[PDB]
Amino acid sequence: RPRFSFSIAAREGKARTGTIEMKRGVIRTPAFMPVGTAATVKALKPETVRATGADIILGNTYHLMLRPGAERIAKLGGLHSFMGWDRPILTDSGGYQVMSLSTKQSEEGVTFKSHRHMLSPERSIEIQHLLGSDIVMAFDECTPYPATPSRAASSMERSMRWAKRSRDAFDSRKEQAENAALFGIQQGSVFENLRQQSADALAEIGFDGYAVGGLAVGEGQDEMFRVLDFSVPMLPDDKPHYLMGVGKPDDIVGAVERGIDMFDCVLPTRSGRNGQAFTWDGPINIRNARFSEDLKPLDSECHCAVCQKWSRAYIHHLIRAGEILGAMLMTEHNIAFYQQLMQKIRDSISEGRFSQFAQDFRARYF
Amino acid sequence: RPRFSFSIAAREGKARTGTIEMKRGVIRTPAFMPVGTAATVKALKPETVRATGADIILGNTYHLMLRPGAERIAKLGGLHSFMGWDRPILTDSGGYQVMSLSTKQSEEGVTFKSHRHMLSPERSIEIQHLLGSDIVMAFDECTPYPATPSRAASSMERSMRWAKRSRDAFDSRKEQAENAALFGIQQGSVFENLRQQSADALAEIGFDGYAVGGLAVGEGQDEMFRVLDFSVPMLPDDKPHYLMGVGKPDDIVGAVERGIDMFDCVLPTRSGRNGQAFTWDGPINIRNARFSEDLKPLDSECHCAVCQKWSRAYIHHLIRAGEILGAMLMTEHNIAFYQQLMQKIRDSISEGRFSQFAQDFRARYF
Numbered sequence: 255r256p257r258f259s260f261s262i263a264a265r266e267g268k269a270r271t272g273t274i275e276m277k278r279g280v281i282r283t284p285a286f287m288p289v290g291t292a293a294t295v296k297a298l299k300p301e302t303v304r305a306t307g308a309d310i311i312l313g314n315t316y317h318l319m320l321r322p323g324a325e326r327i328a329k330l331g332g333l334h335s336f337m338g339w340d341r342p343i344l345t346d347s348g349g350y351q352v353m354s355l356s357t358k359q360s361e362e363g364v365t366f367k368s369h370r371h372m373l374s375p376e377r378s379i380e381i382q383h384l385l386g387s388d389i390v391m392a393f394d395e396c397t398p399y400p401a402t403p404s405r406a407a408s409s410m411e412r413s414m415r416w417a418k419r420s421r422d423a424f425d426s427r428k429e430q431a432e433n434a435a436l437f438g439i440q441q442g443s444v445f446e447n448l449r450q451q452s453a454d455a456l457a458e459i460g461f462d463g464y465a466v467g468g469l470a471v472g473e474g475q476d477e478m479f480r481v482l483d484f485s486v487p488m489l490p491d492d493k494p495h496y497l498m499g500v501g502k503p504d505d506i507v508g509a510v511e512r513g514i515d516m517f518d519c520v521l522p523t524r525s526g527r528n529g530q531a532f533t534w535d536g537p538i539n540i541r542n543a544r545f546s547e548d549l550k551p552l553d554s555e556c557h558c559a560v561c562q563k564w565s566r567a568y569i570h571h572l573i574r575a576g577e578i579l580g581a582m583l584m585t586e587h588n589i590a591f592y593q594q595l596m597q598k599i600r601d602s603i604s605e606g607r608f609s610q611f612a613q614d615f616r617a618r619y620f
Numbered sequence: 621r622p623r624f625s626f627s628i629a630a631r632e633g634k635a636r637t638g639t640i641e642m643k644r645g646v647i648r649t650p651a652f653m654p655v656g657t658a659a660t661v662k663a664l665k666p667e668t669v670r671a672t673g674a675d676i677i678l679g680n681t682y683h684l685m686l687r688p689g690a691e692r693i694a695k696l697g698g699l700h701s702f703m704g705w706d707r708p709i710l711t712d713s714g715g716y717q718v719m720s721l722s723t724k725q726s727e728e729g730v731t732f733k734s735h736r737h738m739l740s741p742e743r744s745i746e747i748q749h750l751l752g753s754d755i756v757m758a759f760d761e762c763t764p765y766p767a768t769p770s771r772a773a774s775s776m777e778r779s780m781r782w783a784k785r786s787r788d789a790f791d792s793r794k795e796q797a798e799n800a801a802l803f804g805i806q807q808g809s810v811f812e813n814l815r816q817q818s819a820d821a822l823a824e825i826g827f828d829g830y831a832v833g834g835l836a837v838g839e840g841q842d843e844m845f846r847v848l849d850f851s852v853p854m855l856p857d858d859k860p861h862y863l864m865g866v867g868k869p870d871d872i873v874g875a876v877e878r879g880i881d882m883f884d885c886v887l888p889t890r891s892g893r894n895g896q897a898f899t900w901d902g903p904i905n906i907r908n909a910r911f912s913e914d915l916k917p918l919d920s921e922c923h924c925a926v927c928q929k930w931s932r933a934y935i936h937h938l939i940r941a942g943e944i945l946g947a948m949l950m951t952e953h954n955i956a957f958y959q960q961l962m963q964k965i966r967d968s969i970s971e972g973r974f975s976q977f978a979q980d981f982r983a984r985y986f
């Protein structure tokens with residue numbers, strides 16, 4: 255396969271379905287990327303992650319640079335070898351968790367004290383290289399919501415300067431430039447003019463893919479959809495569109511209807527461990543006493559291994575008992591559910607019936 | 621298969637190797653039974669437990685009678701269906717955890733307040749029936765160590781009376797008597813005469829198997845081996861000998877050399893989650909900094925899936941990071957290691973070279 259090749263096979267309205275070919279494998283879009291925090295998709299072996307249908311996973315950088323360390327992982331052979339996942343891995347720049355998990359910001363980057371460290375566009379790119387990331391994210395500054403036009407502009411402008419620095423750092427490292435891909439991140443809060451300026455700056459620089467950043471920060475789905483309506487069309491049409499940190503099932507369907515090709519979210523994994531299981535009839539909290547003697551599987555249609563073998567009653571017991579198998583089962587089901595959702599989305603778009611699928615999905619889910 | 625059939629295929633000294641045929645499957649002896657607390661072998665799916673080589677698992681009763689409840693599990697179809705393990709399951713009587721996890725004792729049984737409940741020989745047997753246990757343990761009273769001859773005798777005598785009551789309760793339930801097996805438990809602390817009286821009482825009553833109880837309570841391996849030396853020969857030779865709660869690798873080898881056919885211990889699972897991994901060169905604590913960049917597998921010879929795919933460095937990272945996958949991997953390896961040990965024991969006995977294997981094992985393990 256090539257270093258990077260995004261091909262759109264079918265479209266319906268603003269929605270698209272296709273593939274991203276990379277050296278480590280093919281990614282079917284729209285795609286959902288399970289999040290691996292600390293070199294592991296919580297409670298799941300890599301083979302299980304793959305079994306659910308995942309083509310690519312997201313690797314948390316901020317966490318890895320602290321422990322076990324970027325240099326160490328490189329010494330041990332890279333993240334893929336380290337955790338046992340040989341397919342594509344997208345790594346975030348760490349420019350988000352730093353300003354939320356641990357700090358002094360400047361035009362040069364961000365220094366912080368782990369929950370004494372410096373992180374700049376150059377170091378972020380280097381860390382992603384050391385990890386062996388397939389899709390590298392430019393180092394940006396996620397703008398807090400709400401944000402005044404002035405602060406949003408300043409932040410967006412700095413992110414664009416950092417986007418240029420990320421680009422050059424990436425290109426200056428031959429091994430990385432030839433084997434990995436680089437995505438730029440659009441900022442600008444909820445303001446149309448800032449989103450346009452950001453989109454133009456990113457396109458001027460040139461990237462393999464474009465992410466829509468700064469959303470899913472507490473603005474509400476209505477507002478998020480409104481911003482996506484005018485923001486996604488600003489990005490290059492022939493490159494992947496990645497909505498960072500968005501994962502609620504209904505959020506995903508609506509985002510795809512607006513042109514998004516890639517997603518990532520900790521919801522399926524985090525919620526799974528918390529007792530929330532996704533079903534086509536909406537999410538359910540398995541801890542609820544009503545499930546103590548329910549012999550049905552988590553979801554009546556789900557084809558995952560958990561729904562083929564265990565009942566809601568058993569998982570209910572496991573979770574309330576605090577058993578590790580509870581987290582394992584809930585997580586496998588949730589991630590499988592998300593992948594099945596992406597497959598249904600891909601299929602409906604390919605068949606020109608996505609709009610109908612979107613409406614049917616909402617009617618039953620809500 | 622028959623309800624119960626123990627056949628000895630080969631012997632060397634006091635050691636024996638053979639099979640126990642039951643309706644739900646065949647058990648190879650000497651056998652090691654992974655312990656499932658709360659209807660689950662911690663951090664492992666049933667298929668993984670089976671993949672390691674386990675033929676039977678032990679189900680904790682005391683825990684199950686409290687949550688989710690014996691009646692409830694029966695209503696849901698039994699423990700096998702509930703947790704997804706269709707092979708044999710041995711259940712303890714609960715007469716141990718009660719006097720240690722939560723109490724008023726009397727000749728009728730034990731009443732306790734969960735960490736208001738009554739537990740008698742009759743109820744214990746009924747609970748094991750409701751769970752669908754294949755091998756039912758008589759309800760006894762584990763004698764605390766150290767114990768004076770008088771207290772040990774009183775406890776042993778009560779256990780023998782309870783053994784008769786367990787026998788009758790079991791036989792009076794047609795479904796249970798025809799499909800499950802019942803094991804009696806020898807008590808008597810470290811005293812030879814009490815062990816003899818207990819053995820004679822149990823044989824007089826008649827059981828499908830005989831467990832050596834009251835050991836592994838803080839007496840030390842030397843003392844345990846001394847008691848086994850004179851205690852196991854007292855039990856019927858043509859029935860299985862089960863040493864309850866003994867699991868250290870070296871403990872197992874020594875016990876088999878003394879006539880034991882069955883074992884159970886939480887060590888492999890509990891220790892696994894704590895960072896201890898068993899290897900042929902002795903146990904290692906994976907949390908130790910010396911393993912931070914060790915690319916070798918947990919054990920150089922182990923054929924388990926964990927040692928085929930992940931390094932000590934990765935597991936070291938997982939455990940120190942508190943990741944669920946760390947517990948999963950450590951546990952699968954430890955249980956697989958134990959099963960490989962049992963296989964090596966079975967093979968050496970069948971080939972008349974167990975004594976040599978025992979010596980070689982000790983030399984390298986220590």
Ligand SMILES: Nc1cc(CSc2ncc[nH]2)c2nc(N)[nH]c(=O)c2c1
Nearest residue numbers: 350396467468469470498499519520
């Ligand atoms: N919402 C959101 C989420 C993420 C992290 S991806 C992730 N989210 C949750 C887990 N992982 C973002 N990352 C960057 N770099 N920039 C952003 O604007 C941004 C916005």
Ligand SMILES: Nc1cc(CSc2ncc[nH]2)c2nc(N)[nH]c(=O)c2c1
Nearest residue numbers: 716762833834835836864865885886
């Ligand atoms: N050592 C020991 C362990 C167990 C529990 S089996 C188990 N041990 C640890 C987990 N499961 C025992 N159980 C009974 N009923 N009687 C005994 O004398 C006795 C002695």
Ligand SMILES: [Zn+2]
Nearest residue numbers: 556558561587
């Ligand atoms: Zn499912």
Ligand SMILES: [Zn+2]
Nearest residue numbers: 922924927953
């Ligand atoms: Zn192993």
